[PDB]
């Protein structure tokens, strides 16, 4: 799809069930060592799921922060259709913990929490331990929406969330730009050019506070 179709898809998802935002510290690394190997496989013998990535869930009205300690990151807006490996409010599949051990302990002070492996625990055992749902991970897209529904509806600001996803080139819908950051804009500019030259003409997207806006050129 061309730029206008990617933007239309992006906003359609943002304004309904949401989608992903992946900030990156080094856009050349993301391009050369994650996006390009994915594309090489897609155009070769077929797309595969060798590269997993971290991302945040974004959605209209969800006042969610993104991870950018120095306000100097660009990033990728990624379709909701990306393969999902796990989500928490706090790599290969199997490594996502079912619950946040340290968070759950400071919630319940139940020392029996330390007798289990948070990657190998049953639903029954999590219920028996009393792990509150606030500290449990989820594993399908509908449950991400549910986990974030209450702060979204309240208009309440939330910290960055963590999803592990496997995106394919077709899933990249936009380039993240931090409106307050010359460095983010400089990096986003380079990333967008490189992606367009590969045949992926993407809009610049200013995400902030549960709102997302298309930009001409940064």
């Amino acid at each position: 799809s061309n730029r206008q179709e990617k933007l239309a898809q992006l906003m359609r998802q943002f304004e309904s069930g949401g989608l992903y935002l992946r900030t990156v510290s080094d856009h050349r690394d993301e391009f050369e060592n994650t996006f390009m190997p994915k594309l090489d496989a897609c155009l070769g013998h077929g797309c595969d799921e060798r590269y997993w990535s971290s991302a945040t869930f974004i959605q209209q009205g969800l006042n969610g922060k993104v991870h950018d300690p120095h306000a100097d990151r660009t990033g990728l807006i990624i379709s909701a259709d990306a393969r999902l490996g796990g989500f928490s409010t706090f790599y290969f599949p199997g490594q996502f913990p079912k619950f946040d051990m340290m968070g759950a302990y400071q919630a319940t002070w139940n020392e029996d929490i330390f007798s289990v492996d948070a990657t190998a625990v049953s639903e029954q055992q999590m219920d028996e331990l009393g792990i509150p749902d606030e500290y449990r991970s989820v594993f399908d897209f509908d449950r991400i929406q549910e986990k974030m529904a209450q702060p979204r509806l309240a208009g309440r600001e939330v910290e960055p969330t963590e999803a592990k996803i496997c995106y394919q080139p077709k899933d990249v819908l936009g380039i993240y730009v931090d409106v307050d950051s010359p460095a983010s804009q400089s990096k986003a500019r380079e990333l967008q050019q490189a992606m367009r030259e590969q045949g992926f003409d993407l809009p610049f997207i200013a995400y902030r506070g549960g709102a997302a806006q298309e930009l001409a050129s940064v």
Partner: protein, 75 residues
């Protein structure tokens, strides 16, 4: 290597360790800095409490990793 140990009351501890250190050895280094006998320590990493007898490599703990220290009565 350098690893970090967070307590339940805000504190970050820095330790120099080798990849083949046993968990008992790491707890001895924590004792030296924090005064907690190793039988009174829990070390948590990536959602698991670490067993005595095993090493940092047995848990694939790499450099600049953060562990979480929790105090216990005994064991």
């Amino acid at each position: 290597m350098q690893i970090f140990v967070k307590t339940l009351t805000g504190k970050t501890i820095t330790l120099e360790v080798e990849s083949s250190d046993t968990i008992d050895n790491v707890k001895s280094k924590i004792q030296d800095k924090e005064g907690i006998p190793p039988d009174q320590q829990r070390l948590i990493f990536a959602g698991k409490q670490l067993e005595d007898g095993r090493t940092l490599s047995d848990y694939n703990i790499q450099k600049e990793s953060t562990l979480h220290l929790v105090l216990r009565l005994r064991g």
